[PDB]
Design a protein around this ligand. Structure first.
Ligand SMILES: Nc1ncnc2c1ncn2[C@@H]1O[C@H](COP(=O)(O)O)[C@@H](OP(=O)(O)O)[C@H]1O
Ligand SMILES: Nc1ncnc2c1ncn2[C@@H]1O[C@H](COP(=O)(O)O)[C@@H](OP(=O)(O)O)[C@H]1O
Ligand code: NA
Ligand code: NA
Ligand code: NA
Ligand code: NA
Ligand SMILES: [Zn+2]
Ligand SMILES: [Zn+2]
Ligand SMILES: [Zn+2]
Ligand SMILES: [Zn+2]
Lengths: 303, 303
């Protein structure tokens, strides 16, 4: 119903929600979708997960839920207000496009709820080896509530619980509406991965998803925040630099206890005993991207 | 644009926002408006002030505002999302009506902002002697963040600062859009007061506003929350029981220092030296209401 410079948006439109634990390729994924001529994701809104969390807290409190129900502010009203708020933020914080998309990592803790609010929405759950994600948080000093960066053990424990929840939500939403996307397979085989992802989304193939680095900052392309912690990685083409760099840099006691700390590794198909797991041939495309990146073809932006 | 069982609602519609410090007649005011056939206010939503406060905090933080601006979540986007959220809650948490109304006391701390979000909205700032409001909070044990009920001095200090802010907002919005409504004049002269208020609002007179006790719980009437602290007072007709009952029950040192603790009393036209100020003849209507109330004509509801 609501319009934009002529695109119409509403609760029945086919939204794409991207998420996962931070440092799992979520920015790369949404940037590759942003490259598509029909899709716009844009930057992390930050406020969508905040308001979702507050609204969830309201109903989890017995005392507050009683007061809200007695005020006529029922689940039905809260849900309508969440729909309207989320739609405005998604629609207005970036360029209009036929298919709107949002990437705020921890929103996928609420994919069951979002799939009911937005009955035609679909979900991409980014999955990356928790050892790589946690190594990224600690070495880059990425602040995430609840993740004590002084402890690999604590961060892997918290990674495990977060992805356990999001994976359970993805399974409950079901295979027609939520697709786990493995970062390692995305970087090894981006063409095959995006072919599968766009088929799942019901969106026609476009080569543009393999050209996202051409489209940084351009109209209809990839809008980046200079403050977000993945920006200087996503300005490069898909490459292998970050695939395995955690290995040998995790404390020995955590390596020993890996499968007990992070049982979701094996649940998701990762080898929690290998340092590191042995992946097969990357596509020639990514091998060439990688040597260009490592020899300095992509300069650090002045901004 | 948006519809309801056929009433249309949107950001240009003529909303009424009622507010003031709690225990200042805000529930009585909105109940008298609810009695009008064209207006529905309903219960305190609770969540409108919460989300307003959070959204204000976002922009007050230099670091967070930079991140939001870099994400495309500008003031323009935040404002659109606030409009959509607030409208859904106002519209859906009670019955539809031609004129929608909201009463959440501390929202009038933001009347300048709300008047810009909703350019045809108008505001009723309830004003009651701060000694009566604070006496009410303390004796009824009404929990309000920042008000230490063990201290008349602290509560009057906090009352003073709250009404100072809301009155300044009312003056900035200007006389065409915000009307201070004095509780004491409402209860002494309800017909005259409501005539002035409905004229200010641009709404035709209806006798119903002087019959709100007939309309409790009825369709098109006054919906109450059994948990709100004013409910067992507002089920009675306008009466004088609460006009002056604070007098002699305030600690002597606070009486001595009243004008220094609460300079807004004199600013608003109250006599901060009188215990209590001497009001003139109540309307016969209210005198009769009062003896009926005090002799027990209105039974305590079983619920
Ligand atoms: N073009 C690209 N090719 C491969 N990985 C990329 C990439 N752009 C970003 N990534 C990876 O995405 C990870 C961040 O994920 P997220 O966006 O969910 O926070 C970073 O991992 P590292 O910090 O281990 O390098 C980054 O290397
Ligand atoms: N019918 C009525 N006539 C007069 N005052 C009323 C009333 N219904 C409620 N009020 C007063 O409204 C005050 C509460 O204001 P609010 O709704 O803003 O919290 C209560 O003051 P007291 O607690 O001093 O009795 C209550 O007495
Ligand atoms: Na695009
Ligand atoms: Na930006
Ligand atoms: Na009404
Ligand atoms: Na109710
Ligand atoms: Zn290219
Ligand atoms: Zn390392
Ligand atoms: Zn009557
Ligand atoms: Zn008393």
């Amino acid at each position: 119903e609501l319009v934009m410079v002529e695109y119409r948006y509403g609760k029945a439109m086919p939204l794409i929600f991207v998420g996962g634990v931070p440092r799992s390729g979520t920015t790369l994924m949404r940037a590759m979708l942003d490259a598509h001529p029909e899709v716009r994701c844009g930057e992390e809104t930050r406020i969508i997960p905040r308001v979702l969390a507050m609204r969830q807290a309201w109903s989890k409190s017995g005392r507050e839920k009683l007061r809200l129900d007695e005020a006529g502010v029922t689940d039905e009203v809260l849900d309508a207000a969440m729909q309207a708020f989320i739609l405005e933020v998604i629609a207005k914080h970036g360029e209009p496009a036929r298919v709107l998309c949002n990437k705020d990592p921890f929103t996928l803790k609420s994919s069951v709820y979002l799939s009911r609010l937005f009955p035609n929405s679909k979900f991409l759950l980014m999955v990356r080896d928790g050892r790589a994600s946690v190594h990224s948080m600690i070495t880059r000093k990425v602040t995430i509530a609840g993740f004590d960066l002084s402890s690999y053990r604590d961060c892997l424990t918290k990674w495990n619980k977060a992805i356990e929840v999001m994976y359970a939500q993805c399974m409950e939403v079901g295979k027609e509406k939520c697709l786990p996307v493995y970062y390692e397979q995305l970087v090894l085989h981006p063409r095959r991965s995006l072919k599968l992802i766009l088929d799942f989304l019901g969106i026609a193939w476009s080569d543009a998803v393999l050209h996202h680095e051409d489209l940084i900052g351009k109209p209809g392309g990839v809008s980046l925040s200079k403050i977000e912690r993945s920006t200087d990685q996503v300005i490069k083409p898909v490459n292998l630099e970050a695939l395995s760099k955690w290995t040998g840099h995790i404390p020995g006691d955590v390596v020993r206890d890996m499968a007990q700390i992070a049982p979701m590794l094996a649940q998701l198909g990762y080898d929690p005993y290998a340092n590191p797991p042995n992946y097969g041939n990357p596509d020639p495309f990514v091998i060439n991207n990688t040597q260009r990146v490592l020899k300095g073809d992509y300069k650090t932006p002045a901004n």
